Amino acid sequence: MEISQPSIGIFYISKVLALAPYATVRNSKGRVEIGRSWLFTVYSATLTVVMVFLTYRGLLFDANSEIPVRMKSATSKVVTALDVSVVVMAIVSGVYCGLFSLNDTLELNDRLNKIDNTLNAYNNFRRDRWRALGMAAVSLLAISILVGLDVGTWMRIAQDMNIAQSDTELNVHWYIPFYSLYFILTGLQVNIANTAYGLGRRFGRLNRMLSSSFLAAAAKNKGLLLKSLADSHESLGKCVHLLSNSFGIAVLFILVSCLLHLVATAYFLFLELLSKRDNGYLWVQMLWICFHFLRLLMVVEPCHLAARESRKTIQIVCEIERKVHEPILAEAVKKFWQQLLVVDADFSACGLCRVNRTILTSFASAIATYLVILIQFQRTN
Amino acid sequence: MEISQPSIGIFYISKVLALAPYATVRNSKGRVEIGRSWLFTVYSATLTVVMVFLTYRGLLFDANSEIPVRMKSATSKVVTALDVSVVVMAIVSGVYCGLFSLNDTLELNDRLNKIDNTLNAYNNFRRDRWRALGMAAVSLLAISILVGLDVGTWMRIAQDMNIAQSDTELNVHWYIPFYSLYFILTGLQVNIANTAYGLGRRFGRLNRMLSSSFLAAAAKNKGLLLKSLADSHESLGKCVHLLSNSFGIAVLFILVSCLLHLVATAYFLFLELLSKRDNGYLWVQMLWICFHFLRLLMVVEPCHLAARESRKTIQIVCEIERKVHEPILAEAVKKFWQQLLVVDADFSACGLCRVNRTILTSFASAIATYLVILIQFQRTN
Amino acid sequence: MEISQPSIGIFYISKVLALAPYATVRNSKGRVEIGRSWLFTVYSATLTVVMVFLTYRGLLFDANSEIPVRMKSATSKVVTALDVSVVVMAIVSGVYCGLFSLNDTLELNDRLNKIDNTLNAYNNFRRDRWRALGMAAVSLLAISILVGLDVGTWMRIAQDMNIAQSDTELNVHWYIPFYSLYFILTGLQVNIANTAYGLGRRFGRLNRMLSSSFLAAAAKNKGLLLKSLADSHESLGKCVHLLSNSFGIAVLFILVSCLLHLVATAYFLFLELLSKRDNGYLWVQMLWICFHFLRLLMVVEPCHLAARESRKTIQIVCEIERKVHEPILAEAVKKFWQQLLVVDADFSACGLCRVNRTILTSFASAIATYLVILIQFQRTN
Amino acid sequence: MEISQPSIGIFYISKVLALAPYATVRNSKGRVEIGRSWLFTVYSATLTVVMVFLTYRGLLFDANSEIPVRMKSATSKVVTALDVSVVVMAIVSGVYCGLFSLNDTLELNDRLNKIDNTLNAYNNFRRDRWRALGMAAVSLLAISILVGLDVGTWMRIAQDMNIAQSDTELNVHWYIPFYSLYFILTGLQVNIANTAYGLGRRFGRLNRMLSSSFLAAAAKNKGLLLKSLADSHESLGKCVHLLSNSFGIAVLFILVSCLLHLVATAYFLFLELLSKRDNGYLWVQMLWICFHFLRLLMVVEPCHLAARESRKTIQIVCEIERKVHEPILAEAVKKFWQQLLVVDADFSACGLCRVNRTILTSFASAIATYLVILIQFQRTN
């Protein structure tokens, strides 16, 4: 987890959402020291447990209700249970990662402090803060609008099914914990995206500095700068591995949630298309599909960018090798090439998969297959 | 995008088809200078928007018609919508790539000018021009014949369904924008194939020159030539990456269109086989399957050839290493081997997939699966 | 197969379960010498043949019985036959591997003796013995409890179907050989896990010793220690290959059994959910799913850990290269880096697949697909 | 294609089966010189065309017959057409490869002559001849027995369906060209297996010679021998590539035929199991499944062995590097290591796939999926 001053707003959002149970104090030097926040540790754990329990309580209440709104049919029951459970698993893994990633967070932020000292020329505090705030605000606004539209649509649907003997509006009101879980999931994804995008952006800054300083006393200082860049690259790779070690299970469950949600939302969209029962429902479902695709991108693109930018330092170093003659500088470039030869740049979600753009292809494949099988069964009866 | 005099006809075809919005002026030296053509930029954007709108207007008109010809049943409606949408997406991505790839086009053509100066011995302007013209003409003739056969078949089908109260021939006439989109797609594929085949052919010429000049003062000039070949190889790799960066989204949507069209056309072929309604329809559908397979090959084979030819320079350089003793020449060959060790040769379609022959296998797998699931559902009812 | 004093209990369990037909005598030095045990060789072969024959005899008896309990319907017959056959194949491959892996066992234990002499500082006999005994005891207790619950559930089910004219309890009693096969399978998995975890743990100990002795006369001895660590790494890789060569077919059939059991148990769980016939049956089936997942992990995690720990020596050696200057020590580190460059660390199950965590993903994919297809067919009729 | 005296019987079998249209004359030195055989070239082409035409003529005759025996139902018609077409495609690709692989055959046999001169110590003419003859004879006997059983079963089935007004035995007699195609396919597979096994066996002999001569004036001769072994390894890799370039399309169509035949034969086995119509049919179908699996192994195992043996020279060379000090010998070993670093050892079937044991896994996956989908559709109606 990256906790820097420009992105401190994302840290506070994650802290209140039970995802970053850390106490941060800003040094007189501008550095943010991080430590365990036992108050917020227990707050995060208790809030997650209570919200998961309330979500499943609302699910059971709807299922056992006189007139269920969402847990009506066996198919609807199964799909809604899966939909809620993937969110529960994703946010539970995220909260667990936040609870048990203090040491990795400290090491990552120390490494990033060193790297940013090395890459001071390419730093932009204003742009970084505004980008982080824009990402957090857009994600939170998107989930807020989507939750509002979903609640309105389901309230209308429950009212259409209302009978004087039973209230179906409270059935919808019992799904508020599920939407709270969705807000926590959005916060977790924003936090992870902030960290991974920071790593990829720093890799790009390192590559740009390399190209500027070697492709655009004095030789000794140049070699010292090349050494600093090599340590920065190695440290950024170790930071990517720290993010993997700390949040790979969260990323894996986010990916599982994304796949399940895409399949389930497309299936419900096509079921309502067959029924042609509520245009507002179709629009809300398409918005949900867009949101799930966008959060899949939010989790996949940062890691793809980080790996791609890390793996393109080899080419710059090869060109420098081809265009260098000083003995000390030539030795430094040879060492950098050796280092980059065996660099593992990809983000791993617990070793189950490598997180990059190829995942999208896999997802597409799976979705198509599952969508084709599910739709045909509905369309051949 | 490669814009050279021998293949200038392909460039003009792509320009009129809204895919190459560039102004080209031939230097007194025979070089083609490229710049933005704002007139043709707006022409391309407006033509694409108008043709997409007209295609979907014709689709809706058929769907809402008194006697739909193609958008008749829910299954037919879905499959026709997908068929049209994949073409729309492919040509829209191609036009977008053409609009926003001027800098990559300029860099690619500068690099190719340098490489062709290096590989002057193996150049064949006459053969290159005739190959490019033959590819463009065969592709355009194939799509023209296929569009004519499709229009005739659908006109006959609409006339067979005609009733005095409504005209079904205008329903067919409203699909002309879709066939225009098909012509644009053919132009885009011909352009991309021209560029990728040029890169693969230049890789092969480089390998042949290497083998001829090292396996078939003076030593200093030989080392200079080896250095020129090494820079040519690196530049061709960067050209492959320029083509990827500029047209990877277009290639990805071409691949998606190919997969969808193969599956959908095979499904309709087998549906009409079950119905046994029109032999001409079956022949036209088999021609469409052949065309979609051939355009899948047109997009996959050039990239496979480029990657394969790029990756076989390592073997020639290894043999030269094994058969060289001069100090300067030995150092040059060692540098070339180092360079080739870390060469990324494959064409990437936006990082989603690597474009080579293995894609065919994947496609086959997917098609088989989808074909098996779809056909069995139709055959078990 | 690893046969060491701390894990000798696992060896005896495997010996009685027909999986380790070896005679072991403890040297005065504490070394365990291993040789062929012809008495236990014939015992293992005969016991496996008799138990497989009795398992299939009980299966046929149930199928041909007046009131079959498990082999009732064609679907139930097929799924039960597959369930029994995967266990039979897994244990038969395990017993065959035990019979024909004496030379590999001897070489592996000699190599491990040398490695443990090298890594004496990080050895923990007490912890190793307690970990091995805990793994064996937990696995045996889990399978015992699961077999007891299964037998009780099936006895109750058979009694519910009992009629005065025929006894269905003997039908359940004829499945005892199948549960004996399950105990043998548990022993085989515990043995393989013990060996693979030993290899991964020794890789980790080697990496820790490297980091401690190089990142935390005298230089000559340090170089000698680095050489010892390099030989230890190469020997551990060869030990991983010995385990692969000896038990890859057993691991492959264990994986096949795991996939088939997960799919079949989930399918029966959902079938009984549709029927809602016996809550105890559902609980037993969920326990079986948990057990099959846990044994899939028991076979996949050790190999993933071994490969991961083997592949992270490259980074330590790279850092040492970056932080070393002595001529002899620098040459030693260069040799170690060369060695690690071309190290094949992954466990291979007969070349069919690489055993690591990605297998889980594959399994999940397959299961989902198969589960989706099977469930939908049941739910659309 | 390998044409050596020990395996000359396989060459003659392939020649008569239209697969090796070459004239071979044995030198006084024992070398076999190969040249184009125009007589046998036209014989091969004409025989293939005639047999394919007769096969499809018999297929159509059965389909159009009064009482079809095999081309009875739409499902049976489709599956039988696919079954015959995969064989036709495999043998047509094999015959085409034989026709257009004279230069590759000559280069491969020259390279093998050189390699066998280098590896004279490990040569065994008697064992090689007996192994080749045993493989050819076992394959031919297996296909002969299977064809006889199939013909007998189908003759009995046709007689059971015979009516006095029409003869169904001639319907079976019209499938003789299909069985002739099967004999040609067996010959092609035996030829390809002979060549690929020769390459893998020579790789193993090279590795054994390396280990014996370096791990079990004088130093100059030892270095010369190491150089000879390095050229032998490079030449064997080029021989593997020659086999790929010449017969990759044949191997690809053999693999496609194997997958289709396994799926189709399993499907027909389960269909007859549902019908329970003829026990002899079930036994013949299981024999066909065994034969198709065994020929899949015959095509997959040789390439897996060749690649595996080629890729294990790196380890021997690394150990020699670690255990060598002579300047010339150390340089020779360094060159060999450099060479092996970038060796592409795998057999490629036209770039579509790499032929090794992982293919089996893929096949299994596909088969399972397809088998599950096909069987469930039959079992849910």
Ligand SMILES: OC[C@H]1O[C@](O)(CO)[C@@H](O)[C@@H]1O
């Ligand atoms: O299921 C359709 C959509 O509704 C939600 O459950 C929100 O309540 C989303 O998870 C899903 O995208």
Ligand SMILES: OC[C@H]1O[C@](O)(CO)[C@@H](O)[C@@H]1O
């Ligand atoms: O759908 C069958 C065929 O007809 C087309 O739509 C052309 O109008 C093609 O896209 C397709 O190959």
Ligand SMILES: OC[C@H]1O[C@](O)(CO)[C@@H](O)[C@@H]1O
């Ligand atoms: O089939 C459900 C479960 O019952 C067993 O067969 C045990 O008898 C297990 O193999 C399986 O997990």
Ligand SMILES: OC[C@H]1O[C@](O)(CO)[C@@H](O)[C@@H]1O
């Ligand atoms: O189809 C079942 C079997 O019968 C054959 O067609 C032979 O005539 C084989 O190709 C197949 O294995």
